[PDB]
Write an enzyme that holds these catalytic residues in place. Structure first.
Site, PDB file in Angstrom:
ATOM      1  N   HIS A 272       0.828  -1.200   0.000  1.00 45.19           N
ATOM      2  CA  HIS A 272       0.000   0.000   0.000  1.00 45.19           C
ATOM      3  C   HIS A 272       0.865   1.252   0.000  1.00 45.19           C
ATOM      4  O   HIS A 272       0.562   2.230  -0.707  1.00 45.19           O
ATOM      5  CB  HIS A 272      -0.938  -0.007   1.207  1.00 45.19           C
ATOM      6  CG  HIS A 272      -1.647   1.296   1.416  1.00 45.19           C
ATOM      7  ND1 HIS A 272      -2.847   1.599   0.804  1.00 45.19           N
ATOM      8  CD2 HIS A 272      -1.312   2.386   2.144  1.00 45.19           C
ATOM      9  CE1 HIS A 272      -3.232   2.806   1.171  1.00 45.19           C
ATOM     10  NE2 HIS A 272      -2.311   3.312   1.970  1.00 45.19           N
ATOM     11  N   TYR A 273       1.951   1.240   0.784  1.00 43.81           N
ATOM     12  CA  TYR A 273       2.865   2.381   0.799  1.00 43.81           C
ATOM     13  C   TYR A 273       3.646   2.479  -0.508  1.00 43.81           C
ATOM     14  O   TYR A 273       4.015   3.580  -0.923  1.00 43.81           O
ATOM     15  CB  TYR A 273       3.809   2.257   1.995  1.00 43.81           C
ATOM     16  CG  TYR A 273       4.541   3.513   2.390  1.00 43.81           C
ATOM     17  CD1 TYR A 273       5.618   3.980   1.646  1.00 43.81           C
ATOM     18  CD2 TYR A 273       4.195   4.207   3.543  1.00 43.81           C
ATOM     19  CE1 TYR A 273       6.310   5.138   2.016  1.00 43.81           C
ATOM     20  CE2 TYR A 273       4.887   5.359   3.927  1.00 43.81           C
ATOM     21  CZ  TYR A 273       5.943   5.814   3.158  1.00 43.81           C
ATOM     22  OH  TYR A 273       6.631   6.943   3.531  1.00 43.81           O
TER      23      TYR A 273
END
Ligand SMILES: [Mg+2]
Length: 638
Positions: A272-273
């Site tokens: 996600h990052y």
């Protein structure tokens, strides 16, 4: 209105910019009122400047956005801030509220509401509030030795206000958002020539302020640089605009080299990052690209961003979802299609980004199937890129940071439309107290698909890849982690006949205790036999699996309640299974696990598995598995 002719605007502008000829001529003659009029004429006819944030041919407004816009019309700001707007209005002590107010989150809603409804009340009001903020929030300074001796009042309050109105966080937000307000409101008669000069002088002050106040590090520095590119790409008529673009580009180029491994993975090891980083770097590239400045980015930046996208495409499943490693939630298909469409405009010669953007209508998939990322520590087995695929993503990499969890060796596995081995996930992103206990629960090594000693979190997270062999009817990963003092965990994954998996776990070293091989089951009805160490999903036709673990004499099995989370603060119960062996001396503990996906549970085969080498071999492995009585040897030499 309260706007006045800011004649210092003309000295900020490159008056030789094409299209500014009448502005320049009038300004040279001292006709600054006519010059300001000509400048507005110029921006209204301009031409070669757009932003990805808005399509002026497709302006829409949401229901809450209409609500913030209507509140803005009555000085309620997304509290009522009074008829004479109190920009320092503090009902209770709330610094966060004071900073949020200076984001002007309702200005652009009023712009959209102005364009869609077509009535001037929105434009009239916004012009008023825009100027009034300028007047009541001056950017000033005072000596600290004097500040301590001044008493509370208008001069002292103005100085303290600067901490709120001109904090770089909010200033850079306005630098980007005001390019949207400018596009929305420019046709209005309330957008007078005097107002334009006020807008540009204020806007320039924001950009100069950010250049003087760049953050030292972090995502905040990325956003500051990205928005400096916004400033210089959307108002290239400023004398300093090329310098602003170069400032932002140099920062982003330097930071992407610090943050991204050579194989394309972002160094937090968090999908996600990783995706959030792609999008910061691409938003910068996009604003430049659509306005003719792509060539100002170094080639290494373009290549690195393209590698980050291909990394993300590879670790994603065919339904466009991502594995929930680290602190990652699932980003769903609708959002990813929007992402691929934007990325395909930026890399139009990349045929795989085009394929993913169009769901296969155009473009082409890569000329490989399984794919490994040896620096980042992610390994993908796949027999197809499409919705019929069998796919496993193994996480076994170097040390991470805050988001990364002690999960080396774990995997997710997806088959014919369903994730059959989902991660326990993040669940609690941040908190204190009881929720912090739940965040740490989800970080445990024992709630992942890997091996623990006495269910302890790994002491060391630093996987070594001993072998990666992505081609053929037998594909192999061999990874080793020194998980605890005097303890080495070697995991061998075989992807056999583009059909099923065999996971061999071998623990060596002098360490003693209970060796635990954990598997986190999918949610739903699952049949098991303690006698056979088998688990067989009982799901609807289409995506099922059978798992069977083969271990030494005396292996025991334990099922405990576990959890799976694909979205923050949401989770569901599923079984946390462990296969446990007492390691009471220096001999190695060895397991073989077969994982076999099938569309219908009733078609799941019978297995056997045996080690050919009865002793652990530091430099190789040979096993024999049977599928419905048919032998398959699996082996390697290191
Ligand atoms: Mg996890």
């Amino acid at each position: 209105g309260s706007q006045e002719l800011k004649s210092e605007v003309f000295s900020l502008l490159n008056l030789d910019y094409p299209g500014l000829e009448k502005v320049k001529a009038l300004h040279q003659e001292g006709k600054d009122e006519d010059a300001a009029k000509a400048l507005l004429d110029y921006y209204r006819a301009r031409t070669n400047v757009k932003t990805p944030d808005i399509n002026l041919k497709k302006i829409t407004i949401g229901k809450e956005e209409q609500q913030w816009a209507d509140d803005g019309l009555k000085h309620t700001f997304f509290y009522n801030y009074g008829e004479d707007i109190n920009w320092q209005y503090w009902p209770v002590k709330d610094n966060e509220l004071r900073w949020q107010l200076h984001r002007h989150k309702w200005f652009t809603p009023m712009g959209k509401a102005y364009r869609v409804s077509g009535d001037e009340k929105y434009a009239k009001e916004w012009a008023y509030q825009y100027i009034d903020w300028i007047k009541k929030n001056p950017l000033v300074k005072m000596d600290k030795k004097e500040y301590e001796l001044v008493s509370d009042g208008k001069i002292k309050g103005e100085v303290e206000n600067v901490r709120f109105a001109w904090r770089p966080l909010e200033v850079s937000n306005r630098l980007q958002d005001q390019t949207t307000q400018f596009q929305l409101f420019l046709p209005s008669p309330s957008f007078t020539p005097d107002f334009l000069t006020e807008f540009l002088v204020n806007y320039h002050k924001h950009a100069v302020h950010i250049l003087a106040n760049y953050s030292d590090q972090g995502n905040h520095l990325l956003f500051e640089a990205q928005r400096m590119i916004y400033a210089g790409a959307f108002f290239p008529e400023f004398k300093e605009a090329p310098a602003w673009r170069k400032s932002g580009i140099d920062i982003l180029n330097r930071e992407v080299n610090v943050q991204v491994y050579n194989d394309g993975g972002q160094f937090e090891l968090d999908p996600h990052y990783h995706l959030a980083a792609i999008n910061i770097f691409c938003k910068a590239l996009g604003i430049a690209d659509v306005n003719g400045f792509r060539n100002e980015f170094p080639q290494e930046y373009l290549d690195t961003i393209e590698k980050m996208i291909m990394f993300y495409a590879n670790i994603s499943f065919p339904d466009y979802t991502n594995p929930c490693f680290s602190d990652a939630k699932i980003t769903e298909k609708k959002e990813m299609l929007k992402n691929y469409r934007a990325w395909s405009k930026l890399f139009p010669k990349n045929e795989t980004i085009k394929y993913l953007a169009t769901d296969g209508k155009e473009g082409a998939l890569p000329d490989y199937m399984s794919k490994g990322f040896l620096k980042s520590g992610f390994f993908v087995f796949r027999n197809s890129w499409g919705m019929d695929a069998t796919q496993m993503v193994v996480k076994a990499g170097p040390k991470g940071f805050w988001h990364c969890q002690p999960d080396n060796g774990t995997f997710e596995m997806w088959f014919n439309g369903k994730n059959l081995f989902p991660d326990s996930g993040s669940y609690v992103y941040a908190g204190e107290g009881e929720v912090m206990e739940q965040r740490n629960w989800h970080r445990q090594t024992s709630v992942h698909n890997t091996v623990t000693l006495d269910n302890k979190n790994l002491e060391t997270t630093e996987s070594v890849t001993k072998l990666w062999q992505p081609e053929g009817n037998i594909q192999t990963l061999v990874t080793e982690n020194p998980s605890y003092k005097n303890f080495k965990h070697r995991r061998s994954v075989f992807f056999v006949d583009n059909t099923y998996f065999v996971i061999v776990d071998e623990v060596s070293g002098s360490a003693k205790g209970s060796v635990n091989l954990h598997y986190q089951m999918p949610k739903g009805e699952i049949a098991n036999s303690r006698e056979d160490m088998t688990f067989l999903t009982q799901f609807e036709d289409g995506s099922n699996m059978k798992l069977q673990c083969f271990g030494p004499e005396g292996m025991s099995m334990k099922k405990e309640p576990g959890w799976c989370s694909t979205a923050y603060r949401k989770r569901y119960k599923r079984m946390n299974v462990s296969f446990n062996v007492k390691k009471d001396n220096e001999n190695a503990v060895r397991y073989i696990t077969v994982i076999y996906p099938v569309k219908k549970s009733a078609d799941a085969p019978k297995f056997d598995a045996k080690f050919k080498n009865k002793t652990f071999d530091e430099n190789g492995l040979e096993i024999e598995v049977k599928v419905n009585g048919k032998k398959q040897s699996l082996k390697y030499k290191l």
